[PDB]
Ligand binder design. Sequence first.
Ligand SMILES: CCO/N=C/c1ccc(OCC[C@@H](C)CCN2CCN(c3ccncc3)C2=O)cc1
Ligand SMILES: CCO/N=C/c1ccc(OCC[C@@H](C)CCN2CCN(c3ccncc3)C2=O)cc1
Ligand SMILES: N[C@@H](CCC(=O)N[C@@H](CS)C(=O)NCC(=O)O)C(=O)O
Ligand SMILES: N[C@@H](CCC(=O)N[C@@H](CS)C(=O)NCC(=O)O)C(=O)O
Lengths: 286, 68, 286, 58, 281, 281
Amino acid sequence: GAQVSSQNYTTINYYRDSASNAASDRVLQLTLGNSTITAQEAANSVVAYGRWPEYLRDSEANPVDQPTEPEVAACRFYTLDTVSWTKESRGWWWKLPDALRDMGLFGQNMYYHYLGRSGYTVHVQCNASKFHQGALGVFAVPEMCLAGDSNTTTMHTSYQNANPGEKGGTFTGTFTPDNNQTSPARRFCPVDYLLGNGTLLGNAFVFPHQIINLRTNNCATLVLPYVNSLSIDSMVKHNNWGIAILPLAPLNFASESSPEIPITLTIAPMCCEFNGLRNITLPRLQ
Amino acid sequence: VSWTKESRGWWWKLPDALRDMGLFGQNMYYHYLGRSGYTVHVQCNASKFHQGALGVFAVPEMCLAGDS
Amino acid sequence: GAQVSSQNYTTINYYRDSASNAASDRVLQLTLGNSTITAQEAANSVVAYGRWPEYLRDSEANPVDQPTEPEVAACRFYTLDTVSWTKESRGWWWKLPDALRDMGLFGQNMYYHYLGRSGYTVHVQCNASKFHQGALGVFAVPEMCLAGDSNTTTMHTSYQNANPGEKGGTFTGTFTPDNNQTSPARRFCPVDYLLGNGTLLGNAFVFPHQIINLRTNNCATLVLPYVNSLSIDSMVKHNNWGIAILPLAPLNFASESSPEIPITLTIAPMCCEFNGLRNITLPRLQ
Amino acid sequence: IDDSFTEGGYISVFYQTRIVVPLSTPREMDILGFVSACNDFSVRLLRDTTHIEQKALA
Amino acid sequence: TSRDALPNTEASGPTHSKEIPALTAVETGATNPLVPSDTVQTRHVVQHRSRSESSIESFFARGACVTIMTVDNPASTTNKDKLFAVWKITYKDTVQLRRKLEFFTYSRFDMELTFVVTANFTETNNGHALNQVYQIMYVPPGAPVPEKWDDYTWQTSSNPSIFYTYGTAPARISVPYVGISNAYSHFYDGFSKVPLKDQSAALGDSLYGAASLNDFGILAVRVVNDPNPTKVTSKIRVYLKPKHIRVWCPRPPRAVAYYGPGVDYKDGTLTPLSTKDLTTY
Amino acid sequence: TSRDALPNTEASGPTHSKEIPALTAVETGATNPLVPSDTVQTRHVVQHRSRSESSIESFFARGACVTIMTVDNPASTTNKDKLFAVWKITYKDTVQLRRKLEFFTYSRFDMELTFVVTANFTETNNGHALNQVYQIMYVPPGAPVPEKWDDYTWQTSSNPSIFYTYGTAPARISVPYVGISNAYSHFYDGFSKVPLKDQSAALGDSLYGAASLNDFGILAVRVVNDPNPTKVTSKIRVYLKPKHIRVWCPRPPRAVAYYGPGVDYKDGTLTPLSTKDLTTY
Ligand SMILES: CCO/N=C/c1ccc(OCC[C@@H](C)CCN2CCN(c3ccncc3)C2=O)cc1
Ligand SMILES: CCO/N=C/c1ccc(OCC[C@@H](C)CCN2CCN(c3ccncc3)C2=O)cc1
Ligand SMILES: N[C@@H](CCC(=O)N[C@@H](CS)C(=O)NCC(=O)O)C(=O)O
Ligand SMILES: N[C@@H](CCC(=O)N[C@@H](CS)C(=O)NCC(=O)O)C(=O)O
């Protein structure tokens, strides 16, 4: 029993284990549940990795009990807070599913079960006039890990500072190490041009992304499937996605020295399901 | 509840008694309309040397009289 | 000449020796000979390992001479002594075929021949009232070896102390080492929670067993086939089975401080046969 | 082993109602517990145990 | 085969019936064969796991150390006798393989023995030595046992032997099932003699649990070289692998420290369990 | 297959049309798939080059050093304890393979480990030593860890081991994919505990990005020989080759020096780019 291939040559497997073997576009409308969105200046939309969200199949299900699928009660658009873009802004970040932990019945289902999974639709809104200039880069990062603020210890960020919620965090232009040994702050110090994790910002376009250019469009839409090394996981311990918004070109208006415009985010869970019902979790978030 | 020789009886309202029960109460208080049926199971055990009898009744539109 | 298998891979044997190769229920009635048993509160019965006793087949017979099969003369129920279960009891044990060495013609055939084999039916009887509580575990152990009472020597138990007969022995709650160097006792010291052999009692349910729960049943029945590494053996040197009875829950009655109830054992040989007739053996049993 | 990322959960026993007996009966009793696996249970990565040790040879 | 996947889980909905699978009776002596579908609502799952690694063949497919033997080649300028090692074959000098095997009452298996040899100098003297060769001889019961390191018994006209050169691959051999019964007996509840009333007390005495079923001979090991001016000490580790193994009559595993070759236990070692409150997680 | 040649170039002449392939919009998030034929006049070229050497299998088909372990056999005339080495399995003690792997978020692969052993004398004394043998034992999580160089744990009844004779070919073994997830996680954005308001602050604390998904046991290495009058120091280099590898979710590569096992960076190392004038070639 020998295998003949071309380079011809012959190979034989000696062991029983394979390990041993030698090797139009501007217009958009979205409807989820009882919520709708319209857009008249869009740059199309992005589906991350070309994969649409879907439910978990029988041939890939780890847990054995019957899952819960709220559907319209939780698969709907939630609007977070609105941030202000000025000439001194460096960028903002959010974690998913951390930013929806207090959003109607989605948060209740999240905190009542032990396992959960879901995809997302993210819609970023920012409008200005024909006399404004600027550009924003919106990136979706799987496993968005940020660096700490300590040069004497590593991986010492507290659970509270890493989960800000719907308010999110911001990037900074400089790295400031914390020197309080008695009362360490235990928080991230993400630098903008390093993307907060030691890699150059210019390469962040490897991740799913879009660009809002004030002279072209005023909104961005990203469709994120569920990504993880497991079929289903704990939503309260682990964040699946991170959203990062950074000014690629600074904001400017006519000759004013202090222009400002708002930026709003709307996120919708998709195909979300849960397992392992028990008493509700009461985390220490302060 | 505790059944003694001075007891006169107890009553409950449905869906009022499940208003703080897991996700059922959350769904009840988040929506404007709802409907449901029920399964009720009453448990009471004693010995072969006890005697007594309980009547359990389910009343639709159980309206009670006031104290005035 | 090569063997092709799947993992495909190929294997060849180089040597001529394979060693070199790389790798209703409550009611019961029993009738044996001229003896019968009836039971009205039973928990069914247990057949050890799912095998019924049988005679030795031609394709497995070591000795060449004609065997003896007494049948009804020896395959019958014999009642041993009755023990008393109180609140201070720790348990009792018996050895088979040692406990039937003085039982009618079975003992005579046992002591007149050189080889013998047999299975057994064991029936334990214990009844109380509806106001008693308690539980007994009955276990049948193949090769039931017990530990000695000496910490200066091992395997020093005398032949007389290891074969008590139909009276049997008892377990103890504590280990007491013997310190008489001049006149060693040479007897077992079996501890109950170690099952007398250094293994935890909770796991004894790996062996064939039953439980007598005073509120459920009042009798237990175990059917034991012949088990050994030989087809036939010497019954006077080697014991095949051991019966162990232990209180899983202590006996209690109303408010009395000293309740007591009897426990009786009845054992029947099955499919017994013998080989090697000679003059009778006269052991030193005292 | 004891691990936070693969913890299993909790098990408990409660009184639904109380225990009721008549007169002339023991007022205290015992219960026993057993554990076993189902038909979909499996293990892997054979290793060594900490439940046996030695100090001197033979 | 053992690599066959386990059964799939089946979807089950709400139920309302008289049959009660949960309640049972353990007094019978059987185990309730419940599945998760009998107590909770479940979904359909396609199963992929298998029990291939817990089979009897896999559970014993490792080489375990059974003994360490010691030999030496002494200095030429001394009067010490040359040392050769004798070992009685058994798996009870160690605890790990013994505990693994004593999960069961009877077993049959072929054996595979591997020998690992190491050597060292004993004195600071810069003296040297040439590469050594070792003779390992199997002496079955009843054969003559060597008494000197160079007597006639080492001619091995009928005893099998291995000659091993130091620094090469560890030695290896294989053995079949060589018992006089139909299976190996891990436990034996009996004696080898029956005392008789006519005979004296001492003429019937024997040890409890000892039988000639477990007599397999000895291994004798010597250095074949003649002594050098400097002493060299060598140790040989023996590793046993059972293959083609079959077992019968499972038993509970050992819970306390072993004490001798029997089931005896020693005072002061009978507390295997630690503390834990009843209502504490 | 990866050895398939790339597409041929096509001849193109002058053009005059309304369609504009050059102008585009990068705000959408896509890349313009232009070829040279869309902007200049080209000739016909038969292509011969292929992308066989940039595949995922080829990019990882080398053995990379992951650790160097140290053992010694001390002098017989001293009181020093014999040294044995313990190493926790990981690819993050070095930077080259770590940077190559962290181009992606998830991966599956079988592993191939090679061991290269070297030894030397420590003292000028002319003392000598006989050839040494090394035991390398894999201890999975939850198994007993050795504490002395010659305690019972080295009997290896169930732990796999390698016995290596010095001066022979370097040792080698192969391992399958042995993760408890469906793929290896190079990054983990989470914790292992969730703190609770009722419980104390210290009872919920845990490290950021640490999970038991990345616990694979340890390797323990010892010299099996007994000490000689002279000390001998040995070092073992471990080389890891991943094979049958699959990857998911590409990421930008590391641009600054690594600092610990996380994504943290150290002050004074955040200037990876050099100077260059805007209008200078
Ligand atoms: C020169 C090299 O040649 N070696 C040949 C050889 C041949 C036969 C050998 O005997 C093998 C005997 C073992 C298969 C016995 C192992 N077992 C089986 C059960 N058992 C045991 C011991 C003590 N109490 C109970 C069981 C054991 O020790 C050894 C070496
Ligand atoms: C005696 C010789 O036998 N050796 C056997 C053996 C068996 C299993 C072994 O474990 C292999 C574990 C590796 C496949 C793990 C490599 N990876 C996968 C991802 N990962 C990692 C570590 C830290 N953070 C993220 C990922 C790793 O370190 C090692 C040796
Ligand atoms: N004792 C003898 C040497 C031993 C010897 O020559 N033995 C012979 C005959 S007893 C033998 O058979 N040796 C076996 C062997 O060593 O291979 C002497 O004084 O040198
Ligand atoms: N410490 C013992 C030597 C070590 C020893 O003999 N260990 C035995 C029992 S603890 C063992 O299992 N060794 C394992 C091995 O080194 O292969 C001595 O005083 O010589």
